[PDB]
Amino acid sequence: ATVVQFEQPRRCPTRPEGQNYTEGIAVVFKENIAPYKFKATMYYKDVTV
């Protein structure tokens, strides 16, 4: 009357193929907060009485 069976093998997950990476050289720039700086010369005369 009562009859059972063994379970058969299963499909195991495939190992994912994986990511591909591009080799490159990179230079990262940011916002400039430094003021523009340039040298100048002042000419004036102090006066007093």
Partner: protein
Amino acid sequence: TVSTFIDLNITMLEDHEFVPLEVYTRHEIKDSGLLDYTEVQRRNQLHDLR
């Protein structure tokens, strides 16, 4: 030779060093202001001795 074993490959996670990184240093921030009040004062208080 045939094998009854099932393979498994475990490689340890390699070491990795973190170098210090700053987007802006505090000297650049102090230089961000168009006029550092202290330096202006020190320059302008030398007129008689100069």
